[PDB]
Design a protein around this nucleic acid. Structure first.
Lengths: 209, 48, 49
DNA sequence: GTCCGCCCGTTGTTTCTGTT
DNA sequence: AACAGAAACAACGGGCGGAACTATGCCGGAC
RNA sequence: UUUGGCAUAGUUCC
């Protein structure tokens, strides 16, 4: 229904706003907190034959440390994103001089498109997120402790302090849900902060590999 | 097999003997392959 | 020899094929007490593993 | 002294779509 | 039209408690 | 003051 489609689009947008806020990009409080009626008013309460058509919802936002480093959040209108769609998006990124971009998919992407996304990794960074994976924020679930991405400086200092080689840390897969949420590549180290029953707090470290 | 390959065979005795030696060596290594003759020596007791 | 062997060992079958032969028939009679003897002579068995 | 009973990790086979 | 990436189903193989104490039969056959 | 093994059955204790 139109109400359900508006609701899904609004929830996806809200989760992506939270994702960008966690990733350090600059999203304002009003953008973060939109009511369903406010979103209906601003960008159409009728999706079918209406203003919101999985386009004009694309988000361009600049990182808090560099306005030159910006990210896109594209909404393909096709249930199966294809090679030509990926090429169109990469062309738009090239013309706007944008390095990173997110892509929310209706149902899925063909393996050819996924490999054509992987191939241009040093040139461009693009990530695929399903429509179902963003209706909720996995970070807010109580089973998920807080994750903090650590800078290379923090990593070096930690390794020197404990006299550890990076082989000797616990690991976390690059396909992990939270790892994809934070957009972490191999070789980065995340920090886990969680309360403890016997100490009151315990900070762990995980290596993305 | 040495004697046969010295004195000349009938192009199939050599192959059968090669297969038999292969079976004996394989059963010496492991005597539990699926679908094998399961070599025994006496009284029907399989080897070790 | 066939009857004597099958009764002596308990492997119910031919000697050459004592692999699938069901062992556990023809046990040696218990003689610790008269009750032991009687309860041995009146005994059943379920071949379940 | 010679001959003769249940579970579930791998790998295959086959199939079904995407690109050019 | 040819090729290639990913997946459903089928077949195969290894895995299955810990100790201890008695007894009995047998370890190739013909010539 | 010298050393057999394979299999099967029964029994004890958790």
């Amino acid at each position: 229904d139109d109400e359900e489609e508006t609701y899904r689009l609004w929830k996806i947008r809200k989760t992506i706003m939270q994702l960008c806020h966690d990733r350090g990009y600059l999203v304002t409080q009003d953008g973060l907190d939109q009511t369903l009626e406010e979103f209906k008013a601003q960008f159409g309460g009728k999706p079918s034959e209406g203003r919101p058509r999985r386009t004009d919802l694309t988000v361009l936002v600049a990182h808090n440390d560099d306005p030159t480093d910006q990210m896109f959040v594209f909404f393909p209108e096709e249930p199966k994103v294809g090679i030509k769609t990926i090429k169109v998006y990469c062309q738009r990124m090239q013309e706007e001089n944008i390095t990173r971009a997110l892509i929310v998919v209706q149902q899925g992407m063909t393996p050819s498109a996924k490999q054509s996304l992987v191939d241009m990794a040093p040139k461009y960074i693009l990530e695929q997120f399903l429509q179902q994976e963003l209706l909720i924020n996995i970070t807010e679930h109580e089973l998920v402790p807080e994750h903090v991405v650590m800078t290379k400086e923090e990593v070096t200092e930690l390794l020197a302090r404990y006299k550890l080689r990076e082989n000797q840390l616990p690991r976390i897969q690059a396909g992990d849900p939270v790892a994809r949420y934070f957009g972490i590549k191999r070789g980065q180290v995340v920090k886990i902060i969680r309360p403890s029953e016997t100490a009151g707090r315990y900070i762990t470290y995980r290596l993305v590999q | 097999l040495r004697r046969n390959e010295q004195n000349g065979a009938a192009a199939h005795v050599i192959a059968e003997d090669v297969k038999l030696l292969q079976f004996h060596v394989a059963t010496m290594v492991d005597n539990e392959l699926p679908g094998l003759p399961r070599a025994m020596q006496k009284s029907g007791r399989p080897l070790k | 020899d066939g009857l004597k062997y099958s009764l002596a060992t308990g492997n119910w079958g031919d000697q050459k094929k004592a692999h699938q032969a069901r062992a556990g028939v023809s046990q040696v009679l218990n003689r610790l007490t008269f009750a032991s003897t009687l309860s041995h002579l009146r005994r059943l068995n379920s071949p379940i593993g």
